[PDB]
Amino acid sequence: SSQAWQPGVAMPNLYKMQRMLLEKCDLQNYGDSATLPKGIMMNVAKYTQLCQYLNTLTLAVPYNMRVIHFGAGSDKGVAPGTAVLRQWLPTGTLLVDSDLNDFVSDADSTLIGDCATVHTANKWDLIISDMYDPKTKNVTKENDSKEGFFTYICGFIQQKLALGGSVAIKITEHSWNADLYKLMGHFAWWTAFVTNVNASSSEAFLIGCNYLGKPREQIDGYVMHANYIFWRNTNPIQLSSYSLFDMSKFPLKLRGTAVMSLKEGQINDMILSLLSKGRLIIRENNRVVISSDVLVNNENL
Amino acid sequence: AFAVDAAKAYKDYLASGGQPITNCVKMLCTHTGTGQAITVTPEANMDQESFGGASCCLYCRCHIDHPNPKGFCDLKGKYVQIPTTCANDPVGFTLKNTVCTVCGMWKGYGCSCDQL
Ligand SMILES: C[S@@+](CC[C@H](N)C(=O)[O-])C[C@H]1O[C@@H](n2cnc3c(N)ncnc32)[C@H](O)[C@@H]1O
Ligand SMILES: [Cl-]
Ligand SMILES: [Zn+2]
Ligand SMILES: [Zn+2]
Numbered sequence: 528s529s530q531a532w533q534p535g536v537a538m539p540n541l542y543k544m545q546r547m548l549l550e551k552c553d554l555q556n557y558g559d560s561a562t563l564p565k566g567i568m569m570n571v572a573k574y575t576q577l578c579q580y581l582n583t584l585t586l587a588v589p590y591n592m593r594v595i596h597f598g599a600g601s602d603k604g605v606a607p608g609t610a611v612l613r614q615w616l617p618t619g620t621l622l623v624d625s626d627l628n629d630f631v632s633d634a635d636s637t638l639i640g641d642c643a644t645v646h647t648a649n650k651w652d653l654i655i656s657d658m659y660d661p662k663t664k665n666v667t668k669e670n671d672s673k674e675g676f677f678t679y680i681c682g683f684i685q686q687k688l689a690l691g692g693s694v695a696i697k698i699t700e701h702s703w704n705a706d707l708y709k710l711m712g713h714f715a716w717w718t719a720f721v722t723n724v725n726a727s728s729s730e731a732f733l734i735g736c737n738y739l740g741k742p743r744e745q746i747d748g749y750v751m752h753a754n755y756i757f758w759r760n761t762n763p764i765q766l767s768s769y770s771l772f773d774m775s776k777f778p779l780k781l782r783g784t785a786v787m788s789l790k791e792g793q794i795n796d797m798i799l800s801l802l803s804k805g806r807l808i809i810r811e812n813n814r815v816v817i818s819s820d821v822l823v824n825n826e827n828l
Numbered sequence: 829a830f831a832v833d834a835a836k837a838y839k840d841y842l843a844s845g846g847q848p849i850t851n852c853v854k855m856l857c858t859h860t861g862t863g864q865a866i867t868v869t870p871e872a873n874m875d876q877e878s879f880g881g882a883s884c885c886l887y888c889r890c891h892i893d894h895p896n897p898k899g900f901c902d903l904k905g906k907y908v909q910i911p912t913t914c915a916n917d918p919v920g921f922t923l924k925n926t927v928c929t930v931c932g933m934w935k936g937y938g939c940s941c942d943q944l
Contacts, residue, residue: 613880613905
């Protein structure tokens with residue numbers, strides 16, 4: 528439809544309010560591939576459409592913004608998604624990325640290793656994850672909530688996402704976590720966004736917009752994922768690369784959103800309102816310091 | 829006294845007919861930019877492609893030290909504009925060419941400082 532000229536399709540609200548049972552994901556357009564512009568990689572196209580969609584939300588965009596990107600390496604040993612994020616984000620935005628395997632990157636700093644080894648002294652305004660293990664795509668076994676790096680991501684959000692910040696976390700039919708959906712109820716708004724270039728995949732980005740640090744809504748994550756699959760199962764999305772050809776309004780506007788440091792006792796309804804509108808970030812404004820835990824072993828003799 | 833000469837090695841490899849380094853990260857952009865060589869955001873004009881800088885750097889891509897004595901990289905974290913006719917080998921292009929320190933275009937691919 529007219530959806531084909533959008534960067535992708537967000538989960539309609541009515542599907543979010545259902546109580547479906549989890550079924551297998553059977554996509555009508557399965558196997559089809561979008562025609563990408565000449566020489567453009569899928570992950571560049573995909574991140575571009577993700578960023579085009581995020582431009583339509585009420586993201587907080589402060590000065591001295593801090594973004595961290597998990598799962599940023601490719602099997603090519605480069606970081607196409609990080610390159611798009613850096614293009615999108617205002618110049619000077621502090622960008623850190625990470626992956627299990629070594630890769631070369633345009634980020635300001637890159638940590639190599641299991642994400643659970645990553646620690647940061649500071650809080651973040653935006654968290655992007657493309658972390659994924661293709662071995663989860665096992666149609667012969669039950670599709671249960673997954674732990675692994677999702678357990679890390681849930682804790683990291685609750686501990687290190689600034690109030691007002693946002694996240695975009697890649698999931699698929701089999702790569703998902705019930706607590707992560709439940710955590711989407713701690714943002715002013717949330718959705719599951721499917722890029723039009725990859726619409727034949729059960730992939731989506733779970734987007735939490737403007738973190739409130741407490742539940743606005745109680746979400747059962749097993750039911751929500753079933754709701755997501757029901758939507759995908761019943762709403763074929765036409766593969767489309769159209770939005771890639773209009774880049775004039777791509778850059779994220781440097782809103783200069785205010786940053787304040789506040790203690791949990793000071794977060795009143797008026798603060799919560801400002802957080803909910805993309806008008807306020809709550810965190811310290813100190814230096815950005817990160818580290819990766821390294822396991823040491825001497826296997827000699 | 830001994831240090832590997834990766835630049836010479838890549839030049840000789842290309843002259844002997846080797847396939848250019850691939851998977852340089854090409855960006856989507858308007859292609860209405862300034863055309864300067866190395867920029868904080870993609871600046872390709874109609875005659876250029878913009879690439880993520882690190883992916884077009886021989887030293888980054890080969891996991892070797894940079895020539896700069898402090899080991900700094902001119903490309904990492906920026907975007908490099910490559911003439912469309914040379915976009916089949918962005919690494920070779922960035923290695924073989926030099927940026928005009930006055931106007932910021934590639935010498936011989938946009939720099940007109942030596943014409944007034
Ligand atoms: C879809 S790919 C990365 C694509 C990349 N974002 C890009 O821009 O092209 C999935 C990534 O998740 C990473 N990954 C998966 N599990 C991980 C874990 N437990 N810790 C860290 N990285 C992980 C993989 O190494 C892999 O590079
Ligand atoms: Cl629910
Ligand atoms: Zn380099
Ligand atoms: Zn010049």
